[PDB]
């Protein structure tokens, strides 16, 4: 192939985890101008990719889009003259016809376990039935079918990981986030980012399959009282959380307002510690070798979203003993003291 789309869905987190798949694609065929037809807040991840070409905004899960917009995007994908679709939108006919109207050589999608996925095999060269119908709930990997078929042993090795989630920031986002925490009282090497705050905001970057993923504030007040201050910067998803956090944990506690995942990875890259819950920030911390802890609401969910905690040897995983995101708040402080210094 030379031109390849991606009709990925979900938001920040699902499109973030697709970066080893894109690196797999460019590792498979030498020069590919990969495109992305994602939802909003999916484009914002694609500063961190150094591989791709357009990265539009479409919201593929709309299911009754604007017919002007729908016809325009069908014709746009026709005018870009692709060779491979790689949907992972998890839909069948109706959307298989959408991938079929693109003049594509290799129509690839995901397919429901249910019925809304019949008649799709007619219009797809790969079927790739998935699980749970809530595809982010499958965990970190989510694409082992698509990873194992893209690059089957036909001439050489698959090479299905290449040190998965190598995100990369540029100098411009580094300078603007440097100004954003330099407005706070942080030093460019010695601070700790969080990105876990109980909120009602779509900049939380969580998942589609996780519900109770974001930790509270008075629980967080206990966590931030139990921990020594290594300048913990606080990453709010919206400005209405600023005064709320300053009411709970204090006025001296620095708050950095970040809603962009590229800005969030730039804030990771200057940090020295990460106390993220199950958001994009765990994977961004595992990118560029930052020591994370990775809070979760379940040990099993933590294994599904981090299967590589034994590999990086810094992301010492902590979850809740029950479900419902209520952990011990003690031993996590202990190994936060252990690994961050």
Partner 1 sequence: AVMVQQIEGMRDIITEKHVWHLSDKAIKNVYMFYIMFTCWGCLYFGSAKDPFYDSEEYRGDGGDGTGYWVYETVCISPFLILLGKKEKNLEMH
Partner 2 sequence: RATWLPGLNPPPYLDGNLAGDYGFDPLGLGEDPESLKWYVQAELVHSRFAMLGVAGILFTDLLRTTGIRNLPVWYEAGAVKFDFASTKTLIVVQFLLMGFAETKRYMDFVSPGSQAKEGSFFFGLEAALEGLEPGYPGGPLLNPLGLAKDVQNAHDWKLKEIKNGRLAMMAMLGFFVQASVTHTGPIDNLVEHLSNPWHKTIIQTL
Partner 3 sequence: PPAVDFAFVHSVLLPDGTPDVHWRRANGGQKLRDIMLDSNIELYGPYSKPLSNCAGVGTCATCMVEIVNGKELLNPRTDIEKEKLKRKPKNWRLACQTNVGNPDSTGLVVIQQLPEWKAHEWNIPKNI
Contact residues: partner 2, CB under 8 A: 63-64, 91-94, 112, 114-116, 118-119, 133
Q: Which does 250 bind (CB under 5 to 8 A by kind): partner 1, partner 3, partner 2, none?
A: partner 3
What is the smallest separation between the CB atom of 94 and partner 2, expressed in angstroms? 6
**3-class state of residue 52 by DSSP:** strand
Distance between CA 150 and CA 24 in Å, rounded? 8
Give the x-and-dash track for 185-214 against partner 3 (CB under 8 A). ------------------------------
Please say which residue, 70 or 248, places its beta carbon nearer to partner 3: 248
Please say which residue, 54 or 149, places its beta carbon nearer to partner 1: 54
Q: Which residue from 105, 100, 134 is spatially nearest to 120, judged by alpha carbons?
A: 100
Binding to partner 3 (CB under 8 A): which residues in 224-253?
Answer: 247-251
Distance between CA 52 and CA 17 in Å, rounded? 15
Please say which residue, 57 or 97, places its beta carbon nearer to partner 1: 57
Please say which residue, 89 or 290, places its beta carbon nearer to partner 2: 89
Distance between CA 282 and CA 195 in Å, rounded? 9
Q: Which does 148 bind (CB under 5 to 8 A by kind): partner 2, partner 3, partner 1, none?
A: none
Give the x-and-dash track for 168-197 against partner 1 (CB under 8 A). x-x-x-------------------------
Q: Give the count of residues interacting with partner 3 (CB under 8 A).
A: 7
The DSSP secondary structure of 253-271, one letter per residue, reads S-EEE---HHHHHHHHHH-
Q: Which does 211 bind (CB under 5 to 8 A by kind): partner 2, partner 1, partner 3, none?
A: none
Q: Which does 93 bind (CB under 5 to 8 A by kind): partner 2, partner 1, partner 3, none?
A: partner 2
Distance between CA 341 and CA 109 in Å, rounded? 45
**Residue 49 within binding range of partner 1, rule CB under 8 A:** yes
**Residue 218 within binding range of partner 3, rule CB under 8 A:** yes
Distance between CA 278 and CA 296 in Å, rounded? 6
Q: What are phi and psi of 3, to 5 degrees?
A: -125, 130
Taking CB atoms within 8 Å and a gap of at least 24, the contacts of 224-231 are 224/249, 224/253, 225/249, 226/329, 226/330, 226/333, 227/333, 227/336, 228/337, 230/190, 230/191, 230/192, 230/272, 230/273, 230/340, 231/185, 231/186, 231/187, 231/190, 231/191, 231/192
Footprint of partner 3 on this chain (CB under 8 A)?
A: 218, 221, 247-251
Footprint of partner 1 on this chain (CB under 8 A)?
A: 46-47, 49-55, 168, 170, 172
């Amino acid at each position: 192939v030379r031109r390849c789309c991606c009709v990925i869905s979900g938001g920040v987190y699902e499109n973030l985890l697709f970066f080893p798949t894109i690196q797999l694609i460019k590792d498979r065929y030498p020069g590919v101008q990969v495109d992305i037809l994602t939802t909003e807040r999916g484009k914002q991840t694609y500063e961190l990719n150094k591989n791709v070409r357009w990265a539009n905004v479409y919201d593929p899960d709309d299911h009754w889009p604007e017919p002007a917009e729908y016809t325009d995007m069908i014709g746009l994908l026709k005018g870009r003259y692709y060779d491979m679709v790689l949907s992972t939108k998890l839909a069948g006919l109706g959307h298989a016809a959408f991938l079929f109207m693109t003049t594509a050589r290799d129509r690839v999608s995901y397919i429901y376990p249910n019925v809304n996925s019949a008649g799709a095999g007619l219009m797809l060269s790969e079927t790739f039935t998935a699980e749970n119908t809530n595809l982010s709930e499958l965990g970190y990997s989510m694409y082992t079918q698509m990873e194992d078929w893209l690059g089957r042993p036909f001439r050489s090795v698959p090479r299905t990981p290449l040190l998965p989630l190598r995100v990369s920031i540029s100098r411009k986002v580094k300078e603007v986030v440097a100004a954003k925490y330099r407005n706070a009282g942080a030093v460019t090497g010695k601070f700790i980012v969080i990105h876990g705050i109980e909120s009602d905001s779509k900049a939380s970057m969580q998942s589609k399959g996780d519900a109770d993923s974001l930790l509270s504030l008075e629980k967080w007040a206990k966590i931030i009282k139990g921990v020594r201050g290594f300048k913990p910067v606080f990453v709010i998803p919206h400005e209405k959380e600023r005064e709320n956090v300053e009411d709970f944990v204090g006025d001296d506690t620095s708050i950095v307002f970040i809603t962009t995942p590229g800005q969030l990875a730039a804030l990771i890259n200057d940090s020295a510690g990460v106390i993220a819950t199950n958001t994009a920030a765990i994977q961004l911390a595992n990118a560029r070798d930052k020591p994370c802890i990775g809070l979760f609401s379940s040990e099993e969910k933590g294994k599904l979203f981090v299967p590589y905690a034994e590999e990086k040897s810094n992301c010492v995983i902590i979850a809740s003993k029950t479900g419902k995101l209520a952990d011990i708040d003690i031993g996590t402080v202990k190994n936060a003291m252990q690994v961050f210094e």
